[PDB]
Ligand binder design. Structure first.
Ligand SMILES: [Cl-]
Ligand SMILES: [Cl-]
Ligand SMILES: [Cl-]
Ligand SMILES: [Cl-]
Ligand SMILES: [Fe+3]
Ligand SMILES: [Fe+3]
Ligand SMILES: [Fe+3]
Ligand SMILES: [Fe+3]
Lengths: 352, 348, 348, 349
């Protein structure tokens, strides 16, 4: 507003209200901001806290009661009690107890599982049984049947990433329950997907068709490790490879395409040489990082926070960020960048 | 229902104290069986809109930053979103009024309803405006406009404002950094020759270089589809239903990354087959009369009226007279991200 | 740089039996420093062509029916290829003459030079022909034609015949099918020739353009606009005084067919294009006006109708004496799909 | 055609004006279906090897010699040295401690190693070790030379789009000076790109040809074994029963290794007979291990370790495996597919 206030002016606004009209001129210039100004706020979650609350939940929330969906969603303080870590992503610590099972469902929302501690648990994706290990990235791409079974007396914890907040806000979700059909879990070290698609530079003649989401069920830790190590080795030998000095990094990729793992979520993994400081970045859309191994710190909006093994933080859109590595510093990273990029909304500013 | 009320509420005090919401005590269906939008089917009478528009010209002066009446969906909590993704508003430009140049990441179009002799200048290139024309002001293009007449004009503004706001994607720069008045923009003179492409424009483009999709061509196109059907030839999307998509000529795809525009002409008496579609559309009755059915409920429609079909709401159109509709939607978003799904009642 | 007799002669014989040819005995120009085509720069004067075409008019009667004079490149050993990839012939259709429908994997167009009132029927869709029109008969579409006039017509036939023969890619079928109707404009154009608009019934992208005829009015207007824009100080022409368009597939923005690019150029009187080296072949046809070509430093004066071929990597430029209108086709889509295109421009 | 009177002296003018008329013309300018001048043919490895070794001490470094490559010449291509209208296939014989200086050409090339080791092909400065079973790429416009670091010979298959490139006038060539002699176990390429499902953040840009310098035999063999094992386990994986196969692909894209050549590898279970296929364009196969037979135009030819054969366009072909039968395959299919000329007839359908 800025029409000089008036009995008739007020009459007008009355009739708006009454006809579902909201006028653009009274409309708080956050409607069209000079740059992104997210409701979501930068925030870190200490792993020691997450872990403690995870365990206690597996002492108090049994199957039948609340367990079954035993996942601690990280809720962004800025998102009015929604349980969104960012406008576009859901990130939760899922705590799977001894011998525990989940029946099969399917949903349009895209999802991954990054395993933090544990082993001997299979997520069965479209009938294909996928083993889980510390450091593995698992995909359960939209509209693929998934459930899981813990084959062990030991608990497991993984990060659950989904595009739930995007899909809720944009009205895009469907959900189906599995038929009464029986999932008699096989137990293989390697899923059929991996056995077919995890041979570098080779494609089976039976998979000539490109796919919207990756047919790789798990991107195993051995390969991620090997690839980052090799990037640092190359650097030592004076060869081009790292994204920036002392900065090893890979993007997990759909092999049929070279593109992202799934339409709405990008996954990366970074390894910072001890003492590396990344150049400050402004990026459209939101990212979540989790510290896999090592210790260092983040800077967001000029403010520093020390990080250790397991901690997670989110950088909402256009918040300037950089990472500083005390030790060798290994991070897992997911973002909503494919959304941004598909729609030409991506922009990047680099301090350097 | 959740775990035993076993004063574990000590655990809850903790969840709360450092920002955890457990999935298990969780909300409504945070993953619905099919979409159930907070946005709700709604129509706006043109009579109403125009009355209100004319008022805003009398009351809210010198054109402030903009005399645009955004259609607010009742179900989106006073946000000024016609749908979770799109902003649709009636903009009323008074006699001889002008707007300085701005530029924003949000994509926009302008569909002219009544008026003429108004130029929107896009990246320096002056684009005349007429009843029935579709104007693009693609993301990040400078735009402003001048009214060269004593007469008002009204057009509808479509933008991805809601998408942009909720997705944290918006940038904005000011301009007033060309009041020439040609019949046709530099872009139409270059691009509006069927099947031809300038050798200076071999680069494909994110959004269409066509500044204005003029009514002449839209009308001839549709008339030709109906003629062809009369002649027993394939053309119409469904019997008695002619339709086009406005497209980016460098690409054959949608006009902008984020918004699809179409235009429909239904023969009198036509009833479209009921459809469920992911995402929202907004239709505007350009000419003629008939009705919409949304969620089994009928609403009679007259020249100018607008309605919104939020995602997965089953809809059909029924044409009383020959029924001309302009249509825009968030379908490109849905399609680029493989979320599109379509259910059509006749089978198809 | 070679080995030398006795026991060696034994080897060269074993080779010859066992079908080996050694790399070393082979000529360096099996992998040349840059392209050196067997095909050679050459022009054909229109007056010649037309004289011969008419003479063929009498002298070979509908006997006749494949009455097309293929331009044979002196350097291609009596093959009837204008270049290693393309066939260009002048087709002379006599009064009231027709041709039955066939179909072949080889892509084809027809650029009409003189005449009217002839239809080429493409997949059942009747397409009128006029001076200046470009007609497409994409690979694997049925085509035949009917002259409905007492007057002859002459058009250029462009095809990938030489590419298709050397690459083993040809199929051919005869047409035992039924239409002699006479529409002013075809179904394809009726649907696709509205700038920036796409029928909802044509959402699928297609490998070759669905525009049957790219008519002269549109090409002419397009090029005039490009020169007008230039006059007005506006970006448009591809180089000073050089208007030009590429005929494109509207579903795509890409080339008319997988195998052949079509362009049209209009040079302002007095223009001299900068010398170009391009991979692959072009044929140009002077549509109106006069000027000259330079190829390998050698000038040839050109008048209305003349045609010339610039084989791969031969340096070429055009100079316009009057306003100079040229039709142009090339094998560049082949070159570009396979990342073999490279381009050198004298000024750069 | 027509008549004779004063037709003869018009035909004259044509000759003078350089016009061939459409009408007087072998109707196989536009054939019912492809009928290649190139002809089905097989080359016995034992012959290839003997002639390669003879060319050993007879054409040495200097006088010939750095181009010691025996191109397989298709009987039907009039003495051209083209195995097919599109491809050059030769056995290259690299003698002990022999080297080639660096060159660069628009024509795309690969090297499939048949016998030997301890030879490096250096691609754009990046040293690529060679072993039996490895596929090396030297994509168009990349600098390549090699050094043999061994007193032993090596033999590899040279595949190129030379014939395509010469008939289509597409060839460029530069000499290099230019050259590192280092001997790493794995090319820097491989070290960046050979981690399944992973892509370096320094390599986000897609490339026209694969950046993998060598597709090593370990991975080829493991992938094939796995497809057969999956079949055993009742799981979908093989292309047809008993028929494991992969396509070597550009990891930035999922597409072919280079714009103009496709490379595949086949492993047929003992006893397998593939279903007869007509395919547009040409293909060359090399028996890597095992024995069986080809059928081409209904005619059988028994095949042994190393043998090579070419199926020109639209010639109906099948393979029959006596033992387990491993084949390397390359084709001009990317050309045919880019230009929508590809067509496939398969016998079971
Ligand atoms: Cl295949
Ligand atoms: Cl539609
Ligand atoms: Cl050019
Ligand atoms: Cl990044
Ligand atoms: Fe799930
Ligand atoms: Fe604006
Ligand atoms: Fe034909
Ligand atoms: Fe070479």
């Amino acid at each position: 507003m800025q029409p000089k206030d008036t009995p008739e002016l007020r009459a007008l606004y009355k009739s708006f209200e009454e006809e579902s009209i909201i006028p653009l001129w009274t409309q708080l210039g956050d409607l069209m901001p000079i740059h992104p100004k997210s409701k979501a706020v930068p925030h870190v979650w200490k792993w020691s806290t997450l872990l403690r609350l995870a365990r206690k939940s597996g002492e108090l929330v049994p199957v039948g009661r609340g367990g079954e969906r035993r996942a601690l969603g990280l809720a962004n303080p800025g998102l009015g009690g929604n349980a969104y870590i960012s406008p576009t992503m859901w990130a939760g610590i899922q705590y799977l107890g001894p011998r525990e099972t989940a029946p099969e469902h399917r949903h349009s929302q895209n999802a991954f599982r990054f395993v933090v501690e544990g082993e001997g648990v299979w997520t069965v994706v479209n009938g294909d049984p996928v083993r889980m290990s510390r450091g593995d990235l698992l995909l359960t791409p939209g509209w693929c049947f998934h459930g899981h079974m813990n084959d062990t007396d030991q608990p497991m914890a993984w990060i659950d990433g989904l595009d739930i907040p995007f899909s809720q806000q944009m009205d895009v979700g469907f959900f189906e329950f599995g038929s009464d059909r029986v999932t008699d879990y096989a137990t293989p070290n390697f899923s059929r997907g991996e056995r077919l698609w995890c041979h570098p530079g080779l494609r089976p003649l039976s998979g000539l068709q490109n796919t919207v989401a990756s047919p790789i069920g798990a991107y195993r830790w051995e390969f991620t490790d090997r690839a980052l190590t090799e990037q640092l080795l190359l650097e030592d030998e004076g060869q081009p490879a790292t994204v920036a000095p002392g900065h090893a990094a890979i993007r997990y990729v759909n092999p049929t395409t070279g593109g992202d793992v799934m339409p709405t979520l990008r996954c990366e993994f970074h390894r910072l040489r001890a003492g590396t400081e990344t150049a400050t970045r402004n990026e459209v859309g939101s990212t979540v990082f989790q510290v896999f191994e090592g210790a260092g710190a983040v800077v967001m909006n000029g403010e520093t926070t020390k990080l250790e093994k397991g901690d997670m933080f989110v950088v909402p859109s256009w918040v300037p960020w950089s990472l500083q590595a005390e030790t060798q510093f290994d991070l897992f990273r997911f973002s909503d960048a494919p959304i941004m990029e598909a729609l030409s909304f991506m922009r990047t500013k680099i301090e350097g």
